[PDB]
Amino acid sequence: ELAAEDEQVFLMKQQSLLAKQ
Amino acid sequence: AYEEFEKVMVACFEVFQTWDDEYEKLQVLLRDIVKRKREENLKMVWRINPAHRKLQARLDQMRKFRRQHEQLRAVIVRVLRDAADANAIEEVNLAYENVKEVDGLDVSKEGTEAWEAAMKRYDERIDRVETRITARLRDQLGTAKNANEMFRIFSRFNALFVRPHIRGAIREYQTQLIQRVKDDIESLHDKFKVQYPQSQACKMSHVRDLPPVSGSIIWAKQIDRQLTAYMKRVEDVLGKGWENHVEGQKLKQDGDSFRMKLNTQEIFDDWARKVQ
Amino acid sequence: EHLEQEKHELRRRFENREGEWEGRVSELETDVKQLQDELERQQLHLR
Amino acid sequence: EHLEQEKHELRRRFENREGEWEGRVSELETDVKQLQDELERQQLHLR
Amino acid sequence: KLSLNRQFFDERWSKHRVVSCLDWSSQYPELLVASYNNNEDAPHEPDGVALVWNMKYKKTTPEYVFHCQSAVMSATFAKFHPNLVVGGTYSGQIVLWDNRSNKRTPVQRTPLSAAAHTHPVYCVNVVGTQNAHNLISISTDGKICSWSLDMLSHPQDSMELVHKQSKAVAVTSMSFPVGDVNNFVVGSEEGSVYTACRHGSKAGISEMFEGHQGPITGIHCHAAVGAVDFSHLFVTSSFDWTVKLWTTKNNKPLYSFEDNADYVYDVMWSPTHPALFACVDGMGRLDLWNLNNDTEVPTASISVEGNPALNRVRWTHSGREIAVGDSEGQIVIYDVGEQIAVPRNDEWARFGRTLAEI
Amino acid sequence: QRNLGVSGRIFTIESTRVRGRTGNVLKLKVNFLPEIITLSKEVRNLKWLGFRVPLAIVNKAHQANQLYPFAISLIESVRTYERTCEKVEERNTISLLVAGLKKEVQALIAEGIALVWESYKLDPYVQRLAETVFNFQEKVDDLLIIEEKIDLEVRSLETCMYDHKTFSEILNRVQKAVDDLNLHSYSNLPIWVNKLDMEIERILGVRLQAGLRAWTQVLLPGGEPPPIEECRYKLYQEMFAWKMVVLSLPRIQSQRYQVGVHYELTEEEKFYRNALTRMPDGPVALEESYSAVMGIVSEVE
Structure with a gap:
């Protein structure tokens, strides 16, 4: 099951x- | 001939472009000089109108003109290849001859007004040619009874539909034909939904000594061919730009998504892996 | 190479329009300067 | 990739300077417009 | 005298949002499409709304409801496509709505690219004949684009409107002469009308009109067609408390009607009577001027109840009904008395004489 | 004092508080403040009024107006992403199907966070983000309509006449909706349909319980149902005619289009033969059906 991140x-x-860039 | 005319026109426009670029370079130089020697010249007038610009526009009018004639004329030699057909051909030829009588290279006021009058006459004559053509566009329904005959009339005269006035005349047939094509691709969807081993094609292909994997691949390939044919039917019906039309957009999206699944590469790969 | 002709052409066109604008602002500046001098002279001449 | 960043930067610099110059020229155009109107009133005042 | 006929007002959709535009369908003249902008008190609700109400019933609900991503600033019926409803939005998208499809969300929308609009589109209109028609849209950046209702991915024609010194014309209104497709007028935020041409050697802005002293809200060309040609006439309302008559011939106003004590937001000629034109004022007052019978005080008038600012006036095509959209978002319909609406036989000659007097 | 200007990163993930949520909800905005958009109209309007706007502000306003066409495309493109995602969160059922599309938009937005306003890639990027988010919104809107149709049909199975053709007609309509989902390529379709299959199996199992008890009542929701051994055979043959009303229905398939991809489907996968095991009251109702056939045969014998 490929799930999109919240x-x-x-x-x-x-x-x-x-920020770290 | 038109190709030779185009060659001469591009040579002339190369000449004019060279004038423009080199005059720009010189203008930079003379502006630098005027900056250096500003005290020596009180007058800052800098506007010059080259004499040939009046020709440069005028010459462009032939380049735009003959194209708009040739793109018409060749088409009327193809699609109209009925008394109306010969009448339209001779009318276009007469209009071109009438414009051809005026001395195009004349640039003075007399040349300008003669050119304007001749172009106006040719424009009204061609507008009339387009009405004589819309008459045949109505005789389309006047003759054709079934969808296939009407679509073939669409395809034979497809180039003629590129014209701007012609395209808007035919709008009721376009909806009917697109609905019919939607029904056809729906039938194709129904055929493909029925899986191959259950289909009658599988049995009858086994009858004719065709092996099974080749049978499946061949079946899918034919369904793909038919989808291509129907999309080409839509392209002929709606002309260029059918990808982004109101009813062509759904057609194109469904066709692409369907053709994505008509691919048979997986079947061949699985067969090769199994046999190896 | 195609972009390089275009690049040098753009860099040159920048200066080409810049020179025209510099000349126009300079000559209009001198025009307003002359107008101010004339206005001061005429104000003094009035009284 | 590198000379495309530079190309876009130069294009935007040219457009910015064009903006500057049209602003300055339109400004100086209003300056003569109003000063000339004042000059016309001033010459009428002489009489 | 004017008599109140109906009040169209939906609590769900037309509440706390002003009416942005009005239009009557030419084919089905008992239909009114009305735009509505965003409601600041309902952030979760859709920003743009377009409600199509029908008069032949007595239903209080909108017949059709549409809504789109950005606020609808203008909307019109497709004259030759009875199923479409076009709408110009705050973003520059030209949304197209289909009544057949059960989707309220626009079925098409033009791109927000440089090739297409990118500023608010207060002006949209279908112009031409059935075999050759376009959708002309003008935005507040002066860009004008001609699409076809079949094709909204890119515009068939487009150009930016500038008059003098390559200065943008911040178009807010637009109107065309009757039966014409080439010439038109555009009012601008600067407060100057411009007569312009659509296609030709001189394509762009042609002539400038400097009369107004504030931004122009609405321009309307003369609509009544009959014995004496008056197509060159056009009226313009503006923020300068004035409604100015104009001819394409002159360069200065013919007559200025400054009876209004507030802003004037919209003006429209009657479609039948040649001398009757109605203007709506921010004090809540709708005034019909019949220049033949009275060129100086409003021939008839009526204030909406509660004095809400009136944004968009729009005649019925029959000329017997005038719809006004208030700030509340409630459309108020006023039936016009037959003595005013119906033109007498000699009203056209009388308008000729009255124009001669001016 | 404001120092209005545009530069740097195109997005800015700001922290905003939502009522009822202790955590600060992050929201994505285009790095093009509304004050800039107000500035372009401000400078233009004051000039025609006759106010000599300072030339410094004209430069600031004019600079950002060059970037306005890209800014408005991203603002609505970004706003469209928020509302389309809001619609998905409303209906948890369709969450799986838009997993594939939501992945791409998060990839395109992930690409945009690295860009700056001066990038020459901003031209193709704005069209890509605008186009894809439009595709995300259109597919989600269609899914809300497509699943509503499937949801209305699956609830129709509970309250339809106990006849085989009516049951087949409902599943036929449900099958067509699944087939359109297969064409669009919504991801995780096999996982989602299996959940739909089990809920259809439950409903058919419940309806089969009413079918057997109604059949049992006539023998001694549920529809309107030689030697001694032939009587037993005839009664069971009639019961199998009633049992096959539901168990012979076709099973909803998720990959009807993947045709030529050869995976053999057994009898269990083709039809709801297993629905007999999904009766709510266990196998009790089936026993009563068999018992009633035994009771009548006992009396006749």
Whole structure:
């Protein structure tokens, strides 16, 4: 079962990617 | 001939483009000089109208003109290949001759007004040719009774539908034919939904010494061919740009998604793996 | 190579329009300067 | 990839300077417009 | 005298949102499409709404309901496609709604690219004959694009409108002469009308009209066609508390009707009477001026109950009914007295004489 | 004082509080403030009014207006992603099917977080994000309509006449809806249909219980139902005619289109033969059917 990430965890991950850049 | 005319036109436009670029370079140089020697010239007027621009526009009018004639004329030699057909052909030829009488290279006021009058006459004559053609467009339904005959009339005259006035005349037949084609591809969906081993094609292909894997691949290939044929029918019916039409969009999306599943590469790969 | 002709052409066109704008703003600046001088002179001449 | 970033940057710089120059020219155009109107009133005042 | 006929108001869809535009279907003249912008008090609700009400019934509900992503600032019926409803939105999308499909969400929408619109589209209209027609749309950045209702992925024609010194014309209104497809008028935020041409050697803005002192809300060309040609006439309302008559010939106003004590938001000629034109004012007042009978004070008038600002006036095609959309979002329909609505035989000659007097 | 301008990253994942949720809900916005959009109209309007706008603000406003066409495309594209995702969260049933499409949009949005406004890739990227999010919204809207149809039909099985053709007609309509889902390529379709199959099996199992008891009552919801050994054979033959009303129905298939892909389907997969084991009251109702046949035969013998 391929499952899309929840919006909250996805946005937390993207925040982590953005801040550390 | 039109190709030779195009060659001459592109040579002339190369000449004009060279004038433009080189005059721009010179203008840069003279502006630099005027900056350097500003005290020596009190007048800052910088506008010049080259004499040949009046020709450059005029020459362009032939380049735009003959194209709009040739794109018509060749089409009327193909699709109209009925007394109306010969009447339209001779009317177009007469219109072109009438415009051809005026001295195109004349550039003065007399040339300008003669050119404008001749182009107006040719425009009204061609507008009349388009009405003489819409008459045959109505005789389409006047003659054809079944869907196939009407579609074949659509396909034979397909280039003629590229014209702007012609396309809007035919709108009621387009909806009917697109609905019929939707019914056809729905029937194809029904045939493919019935899996191959249960289909009559499997049994009858086994009868004719055809092996089973080849039978399945052949069946899927024919369904793919028929989907291609129906999409081409839609393209002929709605002309160019059918991918983004109101009724062609759903057709294209369903056709693409269906053709994605008509692929038989997996069957061949599985057969090769099993035999190896 | 195709982009390089385009690139040099764009860099040159930038200066081509810039020179025209510099000339226009300079000459209009001198025009307003002359107008101001004339206005001051005429104001003094009035009284 | 690298010379495309540079190309887009140069295009936007040219458009920005074009914006600057049209702003300055339109400004100076209003400056003569109003000052000339004042000059016409001033010459009428002489009389 | 005007008599209140109906009040169209849906609690669910037309509540706390103003009416953005009005239009009557040409084929089915008992239908009114009305746009409604976003409701700030309902963020979760759809932003753009388009309600199609029907008069032949007495149902209080909208006959059809549509809504789209961005606020609908304009909407019109497709004249030759009876099943479509076009709508210009705040974003520049030209949404198209199909009544056959049970989907309220637009069945098409133009791209938000440079090739297409990217500013609010207050002006949309279908112009042409059945065998050759286009959808002309003009946005507030001056860009004008001609689509076909069959094709909304990209525009058939497009150009930006500039008059002098390559300055944008911030179009807010648009109207065409009757039976014409080439010439039209556009009012701008700057407060100047512009007569413009659609296709030709001189394609673009042609002439400028400087009369108004505030932004133009709505321009309407003369609609009545009969013995004496008046197609060159057009009226314009504006924020300068004025409604100005105009001819395409002159460059200055013919006559200015400043009876209004507030803004004037929309003006429209009657479709039948040549001299009757109705203007709506921000104080809640709808005024019909019959220039033949009275060129100076409103021939008839009536205020909506509760004095709500009136945004969009729109005649019925028969000329016997005028619909006004208020800030509340309730459409109020007023039946016009036959003595005013019905033109007498000599009203056209009388309007000729009255125009000569001006 | 505001220092209005546009530059840098195109998105900004801001922290916002939602009532009833202790955690701060993150929301995605395009890095193009509404004040910039107001500035473009402000500068244009004040100029015609005759106010000499400072040339510094004209430069700031003019700079961002060049980027306005891309900004408005992303703002609605981003907003469309939020509302389409809101619709999915409303209906947990359709969550699996949009897994494939939601993956792509999260990939395209993941691509955009790395870009900056000056990137030449912003031209193809805005069209891609705008187009894909439109595709996400259109497919989700269709799914809400397609599943409502499947949900109305599966609830129709509970309250339809106990005749084989009526049952077949309902499943025929449910099968067509599954086939359209197969064409669109919504992911996880085999997993979802299996859940739909078990709920259809439960409903048919419940209806079969009413069928047997109603059949048992006539012998001594449920529809309107030689030697001694032939009487027993005839009664069971009649019962098998009643039992086959439901057990002979076709089984909903999720991959009707994957044709030429050869996987053999057994009798159990083809039909609801196993529905007899899904009676709510266990095998009790089946025993009463057999017992009643034994009771009549006992009396006749």
